[PDB]
């Protein structure tokens, strides 16, 4: 009965039949990065994945630039008001482009699971934190419902902003993968964390408009609450990160 | 428990409800049980109680008590030397430090008196006022403030109490005026301005407590309270935005 409200446009798309295939994948991911992986790496030397990391980070930067451009050309730069933007459920070329860009953003969350696989294989267990695993699990898991029910409108603003910030974030990760010699020039590490914090604030301020807009016909109000609560959860997790990494100096720039 | 209680503030040891978190957990368990289950069941086959005079007296008392607690928070540090940045707890037995610890305990105790709001809802059969937002707030605020009085009764952790007592002067004046009757409720056109004040309060509390995460060399003794205050101010901001949405944007509880 609940699946009768799903967008029929995404029915045949990869992983969109039911939430079960992604729950199995993410269950195996959580099991691997927190339990199986570190156990298998315990009596092994770390893997040398410098070239794999550099190629991966470069691909994510270009893929994020592409998804940002597609979100701009699917609505955000061609008519969206930045207030009550509703989903367009028609089979028009522009409405399908916005739906497919949401699907692409969702799929990119599964590719970004490789971040945690690199941490495990490189034996960087200090980077497998609650903040990282929680974010990398709940972002794709919840975005399945966004692609399935509301692939467009005001619910995609945080994705437009996130793909633009992930261009800076994975350029930092790409530059840091070059080695300890190149990490000394990444003095602006704290400015990237500030950008991520400012991103959650802007996402919360944008989605908060939903609660005040009379006659807003955005079709799935529950996503305003999810977006608002998740941006608060990440703002708290990233403020705890800022506190131990910089205020307490556990992960200062090199 | 015995090792964790070795960090408790000995100044508050003998104070009412401060021996252990157990007496307040029993009281709040009975309150949650009463307002969500027992009370409404007993009122189901009864006429509502006429508590107009009891409500007016209670709201008037809470307004004066909030003015008093606000004044005491101002005279215990906020208006006499607190920087509004890294204000550490003063654990000495100096007159100002004890006055701050006293005011925190009074604020904590006032949360138990405020449980009467929900009792008034149940007895008046206003079950639409017994919402998740109300019961959760009224349960979590006193329950958690026991730990604040017990371990850190002062400093930057009390800013939200200074602000909250000042807003509760406006909020219970609204409740007091609406208790006068349907004739007086028509002049309470500013209901949405009070909800805006409550929302702006959570924003200011979050902005103030966020300083903790960035201040180097801040010697505030219980960092865990910075996380609790920030998370609670986010939880209430979300609950009050959902309230604004159904009460005003969808018109379920518009001013009269
Ligand atoms: C999160 C999304 C938020 C969304 C907004 C809220 C609303 C959501 C609603 C969802 C539901 C909607 C429903 C639908 C409605 C329609 C952001 C996001 O998407 C991507 C992110 O990655 S954010 C999380 C990542 N962060 C962390 O893991 C840790 C937190 N720290 C930071 O983010 C920092 O600010 C910083 C980016 C600077 C990283 O700091 P650090 O943790 O301290 O890291 P290091 O400086 O050590 O990193 C250098 C080391 O990492 C190695 N390296 C390089 N490349 C990689 C890769 N790709 N993987 C792993 N490791 C890598 C370097 O080699 C170096 O290690 P070495 O040992 O050589 O020193
Ligand atoms: C919460 C605290 C925030 C703290 C900051 C965050 C961080 C905290 C960290 C804690 C941990 C720290 C650890 C230690 C550190 C060292 C706020 C607070 O303290 C007090 C409050 O009361 S806030 C919540 C109350 N609100 C609600 O219940 C519902 C939400 N709505 C609102 O708030 C509204 O903005 C408004 C105030 C306008 C009320 O709206 P409404 O719910 O729509 O109400 P009505 O207009 O219907 O009410 C009128 C009816 O109520 C009757 N009435 C009058 N007086 C009373 C009383 N006292 N009790 C019950 N009923 C009453 C009137 O007669 C009228 O009914 P009638 O049938 O006659 O028309
Ligand atoms: C992806 C984001 C980071 C890009 C970094 C750009 C990179 C390094 C390139 C190599 C990167 C490692 C593979 C280009 O910068 C170089 O560009 C040359 C152009 O020919 C200039 O002639 C040279 O002087 C300059 O430093 C450094 O940028 C900055 O460096 C500052 C001094 O720390 C400079 O004050 C600043 O202005 C410059 O912008
Ligand atoms: C295409 C060739 C690019 C070479 C660029 C070298 C790079 C950046 C490295 C970035 C590494 C990527 C993560 C080293 O830059 C740094 O070098 C340090 C010494 O190690 C200095 O202590 C530091 O202050 C300097 O910024 C920038 O160097 C130059 O930038 C010029 C501004 O046009 C300066 O006028 C120039 O004189 C400086 O030298
Ligand atoms: C939210 C954080 C964003 C950080 C953006 C920083 C970013 C990209 C801007 O980089 C640009 O900087 C321009 C100068 O302003 C140059 O003209 C341009 O070539 C360069 O790409 C890289 O710039 C820095 O790169 C350092 C070497 O890693 C340099 O040592 C540093 O001193 C430089 O500042
Ligand atoms: C057990 C009785 C006999 C010993 C007396 C100890 C002494 C006085 C010491 C005087 C100086 C001696 C050189 C410590 O007293 C102080 O000690 C401070 C440091 O811990 C506390 O911060 C402070 O609150 C306490 O009053 C008073 O003990 C009691 O005082 C109570 C309040 O009258 C306290 O609530 C109680 O718990 C404490 O047991
Ligand atoms: Cl962390
Ligand atoms: Cl509500």
Short mmCIF file of N, CA, C and O in Angstrom, two decimals, chain B residues 157-247:
data_model
loop_
_atom_site.label_atom_id
_atom_site.label_comp_id
_atom_site.label_asym_id
_atom_site.label_seq_id
_atom_site.Cartn_x
_atom_site.Cartn_y
_atom_site.Cartn_z
N UNK B 157 27.04 26.48 30.89
CA UNK B 157 25.93 25.56 30.81
C UNK B 157 24.61 26.15 31.27
O UNK B 157 23.56 25.58 30.99
N UNK B 158 24.65 27.28 32.03
CA UNK B 158 23.44 27.91 32.54
C UNK B 158 22.91 29.04 31.65
O UNK B 158 21.90 29.61 32.00
N UNK B 159 23.54 29.33 30.50
CA UNK B 159 23.07 30.42 29.64
C UNK B 159 21.66 30.16 29.14
O UNK B 159 20.84 31.08 29.13
N UNK B 160 21.38 28.93 28.73
CA UNK B 160 20.07 28.58 28.21
C UNK B 160 19.01 28.75 29.33
O UNK B 160 17.88 29.05 28.99
N UNK B 161 19.37 28.59 30.63
CA UNK B 161 18.41 28.74 31.72
C UNK B 161 18.09 30.20 31.94
O UNK B 161 16.94 30.55 32.18
N UNK B 162 19.09 31.08 31.83
CA UNK B 162 18.91 32.53 31.93
C UNK B 162 17.93 33.00 30.83
O UNK B 162 17.00 33.74 31.10
N UNK B 163 18.13 32.51 29.62
CA UNK B 163 17.30 32.88 28.48
C UNK B 163 15.90 32.27 28.61
O UNK B 163 14.92 32.98 28.44
N UNK B 164 15.81 31.00 29.00
CA UNK B 164 14.55 30.30 29.15
C UNK B 164 13.65 30.90 30.24
O UNK B 164 12.43 30.97 30.03
N UNK B 165 14.22 31.33 31.39
CA UNK B 165 13.40 31.96 32.42
C UNK B 165 12.84 33.28 31.89
O UNK B 165 11.70 33.59 32.18
N UNK B 166 13.62 34.03 31.08
CA UNK B 166 13.13 35.30 30.52
C UNK B 166 12.01 35.05 29.51
O UNK B 166 11.03 35.80 29.52
N UNK B 167 12.11 34.00 28.68
CA UNK B 167 11.05 33.69 27.71
C UNK B 167 9.79 33.13 28.42
O UNK B 167 8.68 33.46 28.03
N UNK B 168 9.98 32.30 29.47
CA UNK B 168 8.86 31.72 30.22
C UNK B 168 8.03 32.86 30.92
O UNK B 168 6.83 32.69 31.16
N UNK B 169 8.62 34.07 31.13
CA UNK B 169 7.86 35.22 31.65
C UNK B 169 6.79 35.65 30.60
O UNK B 169 5.66 35.99 30.96
N UNK B 170 7.14 35.61 29.31
CA UNK B 170 6.25 35.95 28.21
C UNK B 170 5.28 34.79 27.96
O UNK B 170 4.08 35.00 27.79
N UNK B 171 5.80 33.56 27.96
CA UNK B 171 4.99 32.38 27.69
C UNK B 171 3.89 32.17 28.72
O UNK B 171 2.74 32.00 28.32
N UNK B 172 4.20 32.20 30.03
CA UNK B 172 3.17 32.02 31.05
C UNK B 172 2.29 33.26 31.22
O UNK B 172 1.21 33.13 31.79
N UNK B 173 2.71 34.44 30.73
CA UNK B 173 1.81 35.60 30.71
C UNK B 173 0.76 35.34 29.60
O UNK B 173 -0.42 35.60 29.83
N UNK B 174 1.16 34.73 28.46
CA UNK B 174 0.24 34.33 27.40
C UNK B 174 -0.76 33.31 27.95
O UNK B 174 -1.96 33.46 27.74
N UNK B 175 -0.26 32.27 28.65
CA UNK B 175 -1.10 31.22 29.24
C UNK B 175 -2.04 31.81 30.28
O UNK B 175 -3.20 31.41 30.35
N UNK B 176 -1.55 32.76 31.07
CA UNK B 176 -2.35 33.40 32.10
C UNK B 176 -3.48 34.20 31.49
O UNK B 176 -4.62 34.12 31.96
N UNK B 177 -3.18 34.94 30.42
CA UNK B 177 -4.19 35.75 29.74
C UNK B 177 -5.22 34.87 29.04
O UNK B 177 -6.39 35.22 29.05
N UNK B 178 -4.80 33.73 28.47
CA UNK B 178 -5.76 32.84 27.78
C UNK B 178 -6.65 32.08 28.77
O UNK B 178 -7.77 31.74 28.41
N UNK B 179 -6.18 31.86 30.01
CA UNK B 179 -6.96 31.20 31.05
C UNK B 179 -8.16 32.05 31.51
O UNK B 179 -9.11 31.51 32.07
N UNK B 180 -8.13 33.38 31.27
CA UNK B 180 -9.20 34.30 31.65
C UNK B 180 -10.53 34.00 30.94
O UNK B 180 -11.59 34.35 31.46
N UNK B 181 -10.48 33.35 29.78
CA UNK B 181 -11.71 32.99 29.07
C UNK B 181 -11.71 33.27 27.59
O UNK B 181 -10.79 33.92 27.09
N UNK B 182 -12.76 32.82 26.87
CA UNK B 182 -12.83 33.06 25.42
C UNK B 182 -12.90 34.54 25.04
O UNK B 182 -12.44 34.92 23.96
N UNK B 183 -13.48 35.37 25.94
CA UNK B 183 -13.61 36.81 25.76
C UNK B 183 -12.26 37.50 25.72
O UNK B 183 -12.08 38.46 24.98
N UNK B 184 -11.31 37.03 26.54
CA UNK B 184 -9.98 37.63 26.61
C UNK B 184 -9.01 37.05 25.56
O UNK B 184 -8.04 37.71 25.20
N UNK B 185 -9.28 35.82 25.07
CA UNK B 185 -8.44 35.15 24.09
C UNK B 185 -8.40 35.87 22.74
O UNK B 185 -7.41 35.76 22.01
N UNK B 186 -9.45 36.66 22.42
CA UNK B 186 -9.50 37.40 21.16
C UNK B 186 -8.44 38.53 21.08
O UNK B 186 -8.11 38.99 19.98
N UNK B 187 -7.91 38.98 22.22
CA UNK B 187 -6.88 40.01 22.25
C UNK B 187 -5.44 39.43 22.21
O UNK B 187 -4.47 40.19 22.21
N UNK B 188 -5.29 38.09 22.15
CA UNK B 188 -4.00 37.42 22.09
C UNK B 188 -3.62 37.16 20.64
O UNK B 188 -3.26 36.04 20.27
N UNK B 189 -3.68 38.21 19.81
CA UNK B 189 -3.34 38.14 18.39
C UNK B 189 -1.85 37.82 18.16
O UNK B 189 -1.49 37.40 17.08
N UNK B 190 -0.98 38.08 19.15
CA UNK B 190 0.46 37.91 19.05
C UNK B 190 0.96 36.51 19.38
O UNK B 190 2.16 36.35 19.62
N UNK B 191 0.08 35.50 19.39
CA UNK B 191 0.47 34.12 19.68
C UNK B 191 1.71 33.64 18.86
O UNK B 191 2.63 33.11 19.45
N UNK B 192 1.74 33.91 17.53
CA UNK B 192 2.83 33.54 16.61
C UNK B 192 4.14 34.24 16.94
O UNK B 192 5.21 33.70 16.67
N UNK B 193 4.07 35.45 17.53
CA UNK B 193 5.27 36.18 17.96
C UNK B 193 5.90 35.52 19.19
O UNK B 193 7.11 35.62 19.38
N UNK B 194 5.09 34.84 20.02
CA UNK B 194 5.60 34.10 21.17
C UNK B 194 6.28 32.84 20.65
O UNK B 194 7.39 32.57 21.07
N UNK B 195 5.67 32.12 19.70
CA UNK B 195 6.31 30.92 19.14
C UNK B 195 7.63 31.31 18.44
O UNK B 195 8.63 30.62 18.63
N UNK B 196 7.68 32.47 17.74
CA UNK B 196 8.90 32.97 17.10
C UNK B 196 9.98 33.23 18.15
O UNK B 196 11.15 32.95 17.88
N UNK B 197 9.59 33.78 19.31
CA UNK B 197 10.51 34.08 20.40
C UNK B 197 11.12 32.77 20.91
O UNK B 197 12.33 32.71 21.15
N UNK B 198 10.29 31.71 21.05
CA UNK B 198 10.75 30.39 21.49
C UNK B 198 11.73 29.80 20.46
O UNK B 198 12.79 29.33 20.84
N UNK B 199 11.43 29.92 19.16
CA UNK B 199 12.34 29.43 18.13
C UNK B 199 13.69 30.18 18.15
O UNK B 199 14.74 29.55 18.05
N UNK B 200 13.64 31.52 18.25
CA UNK B 200 14.82 32.38 18.28
C UNK B 200 15.66 32.03 19.54
O UNK B 200 16.89 31.98 19.45
N UNK B 201 15.00 31.68 20.66
CA UNK B 201 15.65 31.23 21.89
C UNK B 201 16.54 29.98 21.62
O UNK B 201 17.69 29.98 22.03
N UNK B 202 16.01 28.94 20.92
CA UNK B 202 16.79 27.73 20.62
C UNK B 202 17.96 28.06 19.70
O UNK B 202 19.07 27.58 19.93
N UNK B 203 17.75 28.95 18.73
CA UNK B 203 18.84 29.38 17.83
C UNK B 203 19.97 30.06 18.64
O UNK B 203 21.13 29.68 18.48
N UNK B 204 19.64 31.02 19.52
CA UNK B 204 20.63 31.73 20.31
C UNK B 204 21.38 30.78 21.26
O UNK B 204 22.59 30.90 21.40
N UNK B 205 20.66 29.80 21.85
CA UNK B 205 21.25 28.80 22.75
C UNK B 205 22.27 27.95 21.98
O UNK B 205 23.37 27.68 22.50
N UNK B 206 21.92 27.53 20.75
CA UNK B 206 22.80 26.74 19.90
C UNK B 206 24.02 27.56 19.49
O UNK B 206 25.12 27.03 19.50
N UNK B 207 23.85 28.84 19.10
CA UNK B 207 24.96 29.68 18.69
C UNK B 207 25.92 29.91 19.89
O UNK B 207 27.14 29.83 19.72
N UNK B 208 25.37 30.15 21.10
CA UNK B 208 26.19 30.35 22.28
C UNK B 208 26.98 29.08 22.63
O UNK B 208 28.19 29.17 22.84
N UNK B 209 26.32 27.92 22.74
CA UNK B 209 27.00 26.68 23.12
C UNK B 209 27.97 26.21 22.05
O UNK B 209 28.94 25.53 22.40
N UNK B 210 27.75 26.57 20.75
CA UNK B 210 28.67 26.16 19.69
C UNK B 210 30.09 26.75 19.90
O UNK B 210 31.06 26.17 19.42
N UNK B 211 30.21 27.87 20.64
CA UNK B 211 31.53 28.47 20.91
C UNK B 211 32.47 27.50 21.60
O UNK B 211 33.69 27.53 21.34
N UNK B 212 31.92 26.63 22.47
CA UNK B 212 32.67 25.62 23.22
C UNK B 212 33.57 24.77 22.31
O UNK B 212 34.73 24.52 22.66
N UNK B 213 33.04 24.30 21.16
CA UNK B 213 33.77 23.45 20.25
C UNK B 213 34.99 24.15 19.64
O UNK B 213 35.92 23.47 19.20
N UNK B 214 35.00 25.50 19.58
CA UNK B 214 36.10 26.24 18.93
C UNK B 214 37.08 26.90 19.91
O UNK B 214 38.17 27.31 19.48
N UNK B 215 36.69 27.07 21.19
CA UNK B 215 37.56 27.77 22.13
C UNK B 215 38.73 26.94 22.64
O UNK B 215 38.53 26.02 23.45
N UNK B 216 39.95 27.29 22.23
CA UNK B 216 41.15 26.64 22.77
C UNK B 216 41.38 27.11 24.22
O UNK B 216 40.95 28.21 24.60
N UNK B 217 41.94 26.23 25.04
CA UNK B 217 42.22 26.52 26.44
C UNK B 217 40.97 26.84 27.28
O UNK B 217 41.11 27.44 28.34
N UNK B 218 39.76 26.46 26.82
CA UNK B 218 38.56 26.67 27.63
C UNK B 218 38.58 25.58 28.69
O UNK B 218 38.73 24.39 28.36
N UNK B 219 38.51 25.96 29.95
CA UNK B 219 38.61 25.02 31.04
C UNK B 219 37.26 24.65 31.62
O UNK B 219 37.19 24.23 32.77
N UNK B 220 36.18 24.72 30.84
CA UNK B 220 34.85 24.29 31.27
C UNK B 220 34.94 22.79 31.59
O UNK B 220 35.49 22.02 30.81
N UNK B 221 34.59 22.44 32.81
CA UNK B 221 34.90 21.17 33.42
C UNK B 221 34.09 19.98 32.95
O UNK B 221 34.51 18.85 33.21
N UNK B 222 32.95 20.18 32.29
CA UNK B 222 32.14 19.05 31.83
C UNK B 222 31.73 19.22 30.35
O UNK B 222 30.57 19.48 30.06
N UNK B 223 32.67 18.97 29.42
CA UNK B 223 32.37 19.11 27.98
C UNK B 223 31.13 18.38 27.48
O UNK B 223 30.52 18.84 26.53
N UNK B 224 30.74 17.26 28.08
CA UNK B 224 29.57 16.48 27.68
C UNK B 224 28.29 17.37 27.68
O UNK B 224 27.40 17.13 26.86
N UNK B 225 28.21 18.39 28.58
CA UNK B 225 27.03 19.25 28.64
C UNK B 225 26.94 20.16 27.42
O UNK B 225 25.84 20.50 27.03
N UNK B 226 28.06 20.51 26.76
CA UNK B 226 28.00 21.30 25.52
C UNK B 226 27.27 20.49 24.43
O UNK B 226 26.47 21.04 23.67
N UNK B 227 27.53 19.17 24.38
CA UNK B 227 26.87 18.29 23.41
C UNK B 227 25.42 18.09 23.74
O UNK B 227 24.61 18.03 22.82
N UNK B 228 25.07 17.97 25.03
CA UNK B 228 23.69 17.80 25.42
C UNK B 228 22.90 19.07 25.10
O UNK B 228 21.87 18.98 24.45
N UNK B 229 23.37 20.25 25.52
CA UNK B 229 22.67 21.51 25.24
C UNK B 229 22.47 21.76 23.73
O UNK B 229 21.37 22.15 23.29
N UNK B 230 23.52 21.50 22.93
CA UNK B 230 23.39 21.68 21.48
C UNK B 230 22.39 20.70 20.89
O UNK B 230 21.55 21.13 20.11
N UNK B 231 22.47 19.40 21.24
CA UNK B 231 21.54 18.42 20.68
C UNK B 231 20.12 18.70 21.12
O UNK B 231 19.22 18.56 20.31
N UNK B 232 19.90 19.10 22.41
CA UNK B 232 18.54 19.38 22.88
C UNK B 232 17.98 20.61 22.18
O UNK B 232 16.83 20.58 21.78
N UNK B 233 18.80 21.66 22.01
CA UNK B 233 18.33 22.87 21.33
C UNK B 233 17.98 22.57 19.86
O UNK B 233 17.04 23.16 19.36
N UNK B 234 18.64 21.60 19.22
CA UNK B 234 18.30 21.15 17.85
C UNK B 234 17.02 20.31 17.87
O UNK B 234 16.18 20.46 16.98
N UNK B 235 16.87 19.42 18.87
CA UNK B 235 15.65 18.61 18.99
C UNK B 235 14.42 19.50 19.19
O UNK B 235 13.39 19.24 18.59
N UNK B 236 14.52 20.53 20.04
CA UNK B 236 13.39 21.41 20.30
C UNK B 236 13.13 22.33 19.13
O UNK B 236 11.99 22.65 18.87
N UNK B 237 14.16 22.77 18.42
CA UNK B 237 14.00 23.61 17.24
C UNK B 237 13.18 22.86 16.17
O UNK B 237 12.24 23.41 15.63
N UNK B 238 13.43 21.56 16.01
CA UNK B 238 12.73 20.70 15.07
C UNK B 238 11.29 20.44 15.52
O UNK B 238 10.36 20.50 14.69
N UNK B 239 11.09 20.16 16.82
CA UNK B 239 9.76 19.94 17.36
C UNK B 239 8.94 21.23 17.26
O UNK B 239 7.78 21.16 16.86
N UNK B 240 9.52 22.40 17.58
CA UNK B 240 8.77 23.67 17.49
C UNK B 240 8.52 24.09 16.03
O UNK B 240 7.51 24.75 15.77
N UNK B 241 9.40 23.72 15.09
CA UNK B 241 9.14 24.01 13.68
C UNK B 241 7.98 23.12 13.21
O UNK B 241 7.11 23.60 12.49
N UNK B 242 7.92 21.84 13.66
CA UNK B 242 6.79 20.98 13.31
C UNK B 242 5.50 21.57 13.94
O UNK B 242 4.46 21.59 13.28
N UNK B 243 5.59 22.10 15.17
CA UNK B 243 4.46 22.76 15.82
C UNK B 243 4.01 23.96 14.99
O UNK B 243 2.82 24.06 14.71
N UNK B 244 4.93 24.86 14.58
CA UNK B 244 4.60 26.03 13.76
C UNK B 244 3.87 25.60 12.49
O UNK B 244 2.87 26.20 12.12
N UNK B 245 4.37 24.55 11.85
CA UNK B 245 3.83 24.03 10.63
C UNK B 245 2.37 23.58 10.80
O UNK B 245 1.54 23.98 9.97
N UNK B 246 2.03 22.77 11.83
CA UNK B 246 0.65 22.32 11.91
C UNK B 246 -0.26 23.33 12.58
O UNK B 246 -1.39 23.45 12.15
N UNK B 247 0.23 24.11 13.53
CA UNK B 247 -0.60 25.09 14.22
C UNK B 247 -0.88 26.35 13.38
O UNK B 247 -1.98 26.91 13.50
#
